[PDB]
Design a protein around this nucleic acid. Structure first.
Lengths: 123, 147, 380, 242, 255
RNA sequence: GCGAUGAUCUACCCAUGGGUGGGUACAAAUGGCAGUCUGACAAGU
C-alpha cells in the first residue's frame, strides 16, 4: 500500500551514470564519504546532491538524511548496493551514503549537472 | 415538528407529513426527539386507520412492523452518531462502547415508556438481545407476562 | 444566468441566490471590480437563501476531506436537494455556481437538471462572498470562523500526514523535567521536616539520614515519651531492629533533653511529614512511568544506555526528532575514557536514528549495538 | 554574540522586527512561545516589570532565511505587519514560518503550506507549540483542494522552488489574496531556468507577474547572502494596473 | 508556656514562602502537560487550583462536554470550556499518562489545602505568642517582622523608626550613602492601615503605626504577667484608627 | 582474526598509590560587602 522507505530507487543505467560521477568526484576530491560527513555537508550547505544505499542493515540510520534533503531542497538517489557504492567510491570498505559537494571550477561540472538533472526528474 | 404537526392536525395530509418527517430526518439524523416524534406520529396514524376500519365495519402486524423498522434504523443511526460525535486505545474505545450502549438502551427504555403493546415490547426486547441492563430486561419480560 | 451559488464553510454549507447577474463583457473594468469590493453593491448582487451548519467536528473533518477529494457528501446532497427547484433536465436546466471544476461533474451525476458553472464570473461572485464573510449571514451562523479554521486545519492536516500516538515524546521531556524538580523539592522539604522535628529530637535527626524512612519515623513517633516495647516492635515492623536503631532511639528518647512542643505543633508536623511521604510516593510512581514510556518510545537508546540518561539526551537535544537529525559528534557535545565515550556517542546516535524513523522500534537492534559496544570494551 | 553578552534592543523601520545593537548588530523577532528555540539559534532575554517576567527575543539568521536577507538588504515595503494574515506558500518548516508568525503576532494568523510529509511532521509539531499557524500538508497548486481552510488572506509570501512559480502564485492570489494586497516572491534563478542567465529569468518572471495582474513595486537581489536569487515585492491590483 | 515558640514562627514563615514558590512551579508544569493535550484551558482558566480540579473532574473533551463543573467554575466560563473542548486543536492521551496527570493535579490540590492549613496554624500561633502586635498589624506582618529581626527580644530592643524602615534596607542604605531621600514605608506597607491610607497619609500612618507597633512589641516581649488578650494592641489600634480617620477628614484643597 | 555502520589527534612531586594545583553545575555559612531615617510642632476658629 505505501511506498518503501528507500524510494526513489534508481534504474541500472542511471545507477551506472551515478557511480561514474561518484568515482570521478572522488578522484578530484569533491566527495564526502559517510552519513556523518553527508549530514555535515547538508548543514554547511556545500553539497550538490546525495547518494544513499538502499540496503544497509537497517535502513533508518541513513533514512535520517531525506528530511534534511527535503528541507534544504537537495536531490538524492537510492542506489541498491552499499558494496558497489564503496567500490565505486574508492574506499576499502562499504559506504552507505555519499555527498557530491558543489564547486565552480570543477572539471566534471557538466557531468554532475547531467546526472543531477536526471535525479531531479526522477523525483 | 411544528410544520408536520400543523399539516397533520388541521389539514391531515399524512403523505405530506411523511415526506416532511423524512426530510427532517435526512437533515438531522442525530436528534432522538425528532425520532421519537416520528414514531409517535406513525403510531397515531395507525390507531386512526384502525378506528376508521372499526367504524366502517361497524356501519356495514404490518403497522407495528413499520414502527419497529423505524426503531431499528433509529438505534443504528443514533449509535453511529454518538460514536462519531467524539470518535484512542483499547480501554478508551471499550469504555466508550459501554457508554454508547447505555445511552441507546436508556433511549429504548424511553420508547417502552412511550408504549399490540405486548407484541411491540416483544420485538423491542428481541432486537435488544439480538449485566444490570440484562436484569432490567428480564424484569421487563416478567412484567410483560403480568400485563 | 447564474441563478444559485454554493459556498462551503468550516461551519457548514450555504446556498445564495443571485438577484442580479453582473454584466459579462465589462468584467475587467475598475467599476465592476470596485462593486465587488463595496458592500453597498454586493448586497444588490447576492442574497442568502439557505444555510445548514455541520453537526460535529468529526463530520466537519469528513465533509472537508470529501470536498477536498471533490465528491458529493451526504449533507451536501441534502442541502442541494432541498434548495434546488426540479426544473426540466432538457430545457432550461438550473445553473449552480461552484468554485471547483472538479466538483462539478459529481453534482451533475447526482442531480441531472443542474449545470455547474466555474468561470471567472462565478469566481468573482465567490470571491465577493468570501470577502464579506460573516456580514452576509444576517446573524444566523453561530461559532467563530477563526477558531473553526484553526481546528479543522489542524485536524485535516494531521489526518493527511497520518500522525501517531507512539512517536509523541513531550511526555518524556516533561516527565524528566518533573523528576528533576520533584527530587530537588523532596530534598528541601525533607531537610525542613528533619530540622523542624530534630528541634524536638536531635538524636534521631543525627541517627537516621534517609529521608523517606525519617518521614515514616516522624509519622509513627508522635512524642519522645509515649513509646513502649510494643512500639519498639512496631519500629521493628518498620525499618530494622536487628541493626539496633530502635533500641538506640528508645534509649535516646528515654534520656532526651529536646524541648517539648505543643500539640498543635506536633499535629502540623505530622501533616507536613504526611505530605512529604506522599510526594516521595508520587516520585517513585513518576520514575516507573518514565521507564515504561522510554521502553515504549525509545527502546533502542534506552537499551544501549538507560531510561533516565536517554531522557536526558532527548530533553537536551530538544526532541527525538532533533536528536536523530543531528550529526554523530554534536551528540557528544550535548584518554581511553574519551575514546570510548566517542564510540558510545556514535552508537547512541545510530540507535536514535533507528528508534525515531522506524514506526515501532526494536530492542533486537538495541541489543546488537549494546553487545557491540561491550565487545569493544572487552577489546580495550 | 557569546553566551553572556548584553545588547540593546531597538525598533526597526518595519514594525514587528527589532535590531539588537552591540559590537555587532542582530536582526531579532519577539519570541511567541518563550523558552524553546525552534532551529537551534541563540536568543536574547530581557526582564520586564505584580512581579516581573522574563520576555524573550529570537535572532534571525539571514544565511538560512530568505526574508531576513531581504530585510537586511533593505526593502522599502514589506506587507507583513503585526496584525495581518499571511499565506506562506512553500513553508518548509519553522526556520522561516516561525519568524513570520512572531512578526504577525498573536492577533494575525499565518497559513503555512507544504507538500511533502516529513517537513509536514516538523510543521505539525511546531504549529502545535505556536497557535498563530495553521498548517496545510497539501499540494500548493490546488487552492480549490484546500479552499475550506483559508479566508481572504492579506499578504502572500512565496518560497516555492518549482518552475511554475508565477502560475501557482497567480492561482492562490486570485483565490484568496485581498485586493491591493502584498505579494512577496523569492525567485531562485537556477530552479526556474538553468540554461539561460539569472537576469533573463528575473525579467521573464516579472513579466509573468505583470501579466497576472500583480504590479511589481520593487526588486532586490540579496547578493552577499545567496547567489542568483531575488526578491520581488509587488501589489495585487485587480483593477486598473496602469 | 509550651506555646511561646518564635522558632516555630520563623520556621513556619520560611516554609510558607517556599511552599508558595513550589506550588507555583508545579502548577506551571501541570498546565504544560494538559495544555499539550488541551491547549485552550490555560488561556481560559488561570486559577491553578481550578485547573487541577477540572483535570480531576474530566479527562477528555467528551467528559468535558458531558459532565457538570458548577462548583469549580461559573456557568459562562463552563460552557466556554465546553465549546473549546468541542473544537480543541491538541491530540489525545493514553491511560497511564492520564493517570500521572491526575496524580499531579491531586498533588496541587493537596498543596493548596496544606498552605491554607499552615497559614491558619501560624495565625493561631501569633495570637498565642504576640497577641497585641497581632491585634495591631496582623499575623502575616507580625511574623515577617519577627523573621526579619531574628528574635522577639531583638525586635523589641530596636527603636520605632527601625521598625518602620525594616523592609526597605537596600534603598535606605543606598540613599544614605548617596545623600538622597530615604524610603518611608518599609515592610509595613502591607498592613491594613497603610492599605487604607492614601499617599502622604500613607507615609504618616506608616510612622504612627510603627510607633504603636514598637510599643506593643516591647510589651509582649518583656511581659511577666501577660494577659494574652491583647488589650494594649486593641487600644493602639483605636488610637491609630482615630488618627487615620482624622487625617483623612483633613482636606488639602479649598471649599 | 580492524575501519565511513567512522581509523587518528584535541598544569607540580615522589617506580600503574598517595601528597601539591587550577577550572565548571548544586548545596551550607551568626563568613565578607553591611552601616538599621529625622525629632516639636500640626490642624481648626
Amino acid at each position: 500500500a505505501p511506498n518503501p522507505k528507500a524510494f526513489p530507487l534508481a534504474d541500472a543505467a542511471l545507477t551506472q551514470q551515478i557511480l561514474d560521477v561518484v568515482q570521478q568526484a572522488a578522484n578530484l576530491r569533491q566527495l564526502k564519504k559517510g552519513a556523518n560527513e553527508a549530514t555535515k555537508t547538508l548543514n554547511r550547505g556545500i553539497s550538490e546532491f546525495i547518494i544513499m544505499a538502499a540496503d544497509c542493515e537497517p535502513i533508518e540510520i541513513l533514512l535520517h538524511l531525506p528530511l534534511l534533503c527535503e528541507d534544504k531542497n537537495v536531490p538524492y538517489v537510492f542506489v541498491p548496493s552499499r558494496v558497489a557504492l564503496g567500490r565505486a567510491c574508492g574506499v576499502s570498505r562499504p559506504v552507505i551514503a555519499a555527498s557530491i559537494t558543489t564547486n565552480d571550477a570543477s572539471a566534471i561540472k557538466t557531468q554532475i549537472y547531467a546526472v543531477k538533472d536526471k535525479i531531479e526528474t526522477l523525483l | 415538528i411544528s410544520c408536520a404537526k400543523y399539516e397533520y392536525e388541521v389539514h391531515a395530509n399524512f403523505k405530506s407529513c411523511r415526506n416532511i418527517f423524512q426530510n427532517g430526518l435526512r437533515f438531522n439524523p442525530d436528534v432522538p426527539k425528532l425520532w421519537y416524534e416520528y414514531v409517535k406520529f406513525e403510531l397515531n396514524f395507525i390507531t386512526k386507520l384502525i378506528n376508521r376500519r372499526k367504524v366502517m365495519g361497524l356501519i356495514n402486524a404490518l403497522r407495528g412492523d413499520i414502527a419497529l423498522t423505524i426503531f431499528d434504523v433509529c438505534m443504528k443511526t443514533l449509535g453511529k452518531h454518538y460514536i462519531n460525535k467524539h470518535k484512542s486505545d483499547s480501554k478508551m474505545n471499550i469504555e466508550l462502547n459501554k457508554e454508547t450502549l447505555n445511552y441507546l438502551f436508556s433511549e429504548s427504555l424511553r420508547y417502552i415508556k412511550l408504549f399490540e403493546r405486548d407484541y411491540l415490547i416483544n420485538h423491542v426486547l428481541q432486537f435488544w438481545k439480538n449485566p444490570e441492563l440484562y436484569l432490567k430486561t428480564v424484569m421487563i419480560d416478567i412484567t410483560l407476562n403480568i400485563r | 444566468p447564474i441563478e444559485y451559488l454554493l459556498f462551503e464553510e468550516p461551519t457548514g454549507y450555504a446556498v445564495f441566490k443571485v438577484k442580479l447577474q453582473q454584466d459579462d463583457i465589462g468584467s475587467r473594468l475598475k467599476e465592476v471590480q470596485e462593486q465587488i469590493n463595496d458592500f453597498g453593491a454586493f448586497t444588490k448582487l447576492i442574497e442568502l437563501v439557505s444555510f445548514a451548519p455541520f453537526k460535529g467536528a468529526a463530520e466537519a473533518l469528513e465533509n472537508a476531506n470529501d470536498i477536498s477529494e471533490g465528491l458529493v457528501s451526504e449533507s451536501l446532497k441534502a442541502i442541494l436537494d432541498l434548495n434546488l427547484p426540479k426544473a426540466s433536465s432538457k430545457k432550461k436546466n438550473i445553473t449552480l455556481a461552484i468554485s471547483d471544476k472538479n466538483l462539478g461533474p459529481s453534482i451533475k451525476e447526482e442531480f441531472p437538471y443542474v449545470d455547474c458553472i466555474s468561470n471567472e464570473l462565478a469566481q468573482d461572485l465567490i470571491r465577493g462572498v468570501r470577502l464579506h464573510g460573516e456580514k452576509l449571514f444576517k446573524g444566523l451562523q453561530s461559532g467563530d470562523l477563526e477558531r473553526a479554521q484553526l481546528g479543522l486545519g489542524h485536524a485535516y492536516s494531521r489526518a493527511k500526514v497520518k500522525f501517531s500516538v507512539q512517536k509523541n515524546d513531550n511526555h518524556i521531556i516533561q516527565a524528566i523535567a518533573l523528576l528533576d524538580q520533584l527530587d530537588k523539592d523532596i530534598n528541601t522539604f525533607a531537610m525542613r521536616v528533619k530540622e523542624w522535628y530534630g528541634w524536638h529530637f536531635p538524636e534521631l535527626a543525627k541517627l537516621v539520614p534517609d529521608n523517606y524512612t525519617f518521614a515514616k519515623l516522624v509519622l509513627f513517633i508522635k512524642d519522645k515519651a509515649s513509646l513502649n516495647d510494643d512500639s519498639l516492635h512496631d519500629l521493628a515492623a518498620l525499618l530494622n531492629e536487628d541493626s539496633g536503631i530502635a533500641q538506640r532511639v528508645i534509649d535516646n528518647a528515654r534520656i532526651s533533653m529536646g524541648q517539648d512542643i505543643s500539640e498543635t505543633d506536633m499535629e502540623n508536623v505530622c501533616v507536613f511529614a504526611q505530605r512529604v511521604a506522599s510526594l516521595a510516593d508520587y516520585r517513585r510512581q513518576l520514575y516507573d512511568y518514565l521507564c515504561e514510556k522510554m521502553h515504549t518510545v525509545a527502546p533502542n537508546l534506552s537499551e544501549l544506555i538507560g531510561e533516565v540518561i536517554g531522557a536526558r539526551l532527548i530533553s537536551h537535544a530538544g526532541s527525538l526528532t532533533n536528536l536523530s537529525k543531528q550529526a554523530a559528534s554534536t551528540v557528544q557535545i550535548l584518554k581511553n575514557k574519551g575514546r570510548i565515550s566517542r564510540y558510545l556517542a556514535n552508537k547512541c546516535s545510530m540507535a536514535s536514528r533507528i528508534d525515531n524513523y522506524s514506526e515501532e522500534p526494536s530492542n533486537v537492534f538495541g541489543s546488537v549495538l549494546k553487545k557491540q559496544v561491550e565487545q569493544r570494551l572487552e577489546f580495550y | 554574540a557569546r553566551g553572556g553578552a548584553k545588547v540593546v534592543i531597538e525598533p526597526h523601520r518595519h514594525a514587528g522586527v527589532y535590531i539588537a545593537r552591540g559590537k555587532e548588530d542582530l536582526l531579532v523577532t519577539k519570541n511567541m512561545a518563550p523558552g524553546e528555540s525552534v532551529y537551534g539559534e541563540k536568543r536574547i532575554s530581557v526582564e520586564e516589570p505584580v512581579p516581573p517576567t522574563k520576555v524573550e527575543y529570537r535572532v534571525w539568521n539571514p544565511f538560512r532565511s530568505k526574508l531576513a536577507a531581504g530585510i537586511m538588504g533593505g526593502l522599502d515595503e514589506l506587507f507583513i505587519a503585526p496584525g495581518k494574515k499571511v499565506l506562506y506558500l512553500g513553508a518548509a518548516s519553522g526556520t522561516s514560518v516561525s519568524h513570520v508568525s512572531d512578526v504577525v503576532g498573536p492577533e494575525g494568523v499565518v497559513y503555512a503550506v507544504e507538500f511533502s510529509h516529513r517537513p509536514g511532521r516538523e510543521l505539525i509539531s511546531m504549529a502545535k507549540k505556536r497557535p498563530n499557524i495553521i498548517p496545510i500538508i497539501e499540494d500548493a497548486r490546488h487552492p480549490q483542494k484546500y479552499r475550506m481552510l483559508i479566508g481572504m488572506v492579506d499578504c502572500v509570501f512565496a518560497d516555492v522552488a518549482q518552475p511554475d512559480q508565477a502560475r501557482i502564485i497567480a492561482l492562490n492570489s486570485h483565490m484568496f489574496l485581498k485586493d491591493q494586497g502584498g505579494v512577496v516572491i523569492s525567485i531562485k534563478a537556477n530552479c526556474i531556468d538553468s540554461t539561460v542567465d539569472a537576469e533573463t529569468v528575473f525579467a521573464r518572471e516579472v513579466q509573468k507577474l505583470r501579466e497576472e495582474r500583480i504590479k511589481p513595486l520593487e526588486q532586490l537581489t540579496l547578493e552577499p547572502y545567496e547567489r542568483d536569487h531575488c526578491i520581488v515585492v509587488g501589489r495585487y491590483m485587480r483593477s486598473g494596473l496602469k | 508556656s509550651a506555646d511561646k515558640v518564635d522558632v516555630m514562627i520563623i520556621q513556619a514563615i520560611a516554609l510558607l514562602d517556599d511552599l508558595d514558590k513550589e506550588l507555583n512551579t508545579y502548577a506551571m508544569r501541570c498546565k504544560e502537560w494538559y495544555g499539550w493535550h488541551f491547549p485552550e484551558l490555560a488561556k481560559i482558566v488561570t486559577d491553578s487550583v481550578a485547573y487541577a480540579r477540572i483535570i480531576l473532574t474530566m479527562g477528555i473533551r467528551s467528559k468535558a462536554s458531558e459532565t457538570d463543573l458548577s462548583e469549580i467554575l461559573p456557568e459562562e466560563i463552563e460552557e466556554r470550556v465546553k465549546t473549546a473542548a468541542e473544537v480543541s486543536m491538541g491530540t489525545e492521551i493514553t491511560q497511564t499518562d492520564l493517570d500521572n496527570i491526575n496524580a499531579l493535579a491531586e498533588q496541587i490540590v493537596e498543596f493548596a489545602a496544606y498552605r491554607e492549613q499552615l497559614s491558619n496554624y501560624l495565625s493561631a500561633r501569633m495570637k498565642a505568642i504576640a497577641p497585641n502586635l497581632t491585634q495591631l498589624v496582623g499575623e502575616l506582618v507580625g511574623a515577617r517582622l519577627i523573621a526579619h529581626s531574628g528574635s522577639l527580644i531583638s525586635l523589641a530592643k530596636s527603636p520605632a523608626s527601625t521598625i518602620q524602615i525594616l523592609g526597605a534596607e537596600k534603598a535606605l542604605f543606598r540613599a544614605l550613602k548617596t545623600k538622597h531621600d530615604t524610603p518611608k514605608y518599609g515592610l509595613l506597607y502591607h498592613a491594613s492601615l497603610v492599605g487604607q491610607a492614601t499617599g502622604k497619609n500613607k507615609g504618616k500612618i506608616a510612622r504612627v503605626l510603627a510607633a504603636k507597633a514598637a510599643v506593643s512589641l516591647r510589651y509582649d516581649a518583656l511581659a511577666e504577667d501577660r494577659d494574652d488578650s491583647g488589650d494594649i494592641g486593641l487600644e493602639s489600634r483605636a488610637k491609630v484608627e482615630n488618627r487615620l480617620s482624622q487625617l483623612e477628614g483633613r482636606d488639602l484643597r479649598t471649599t
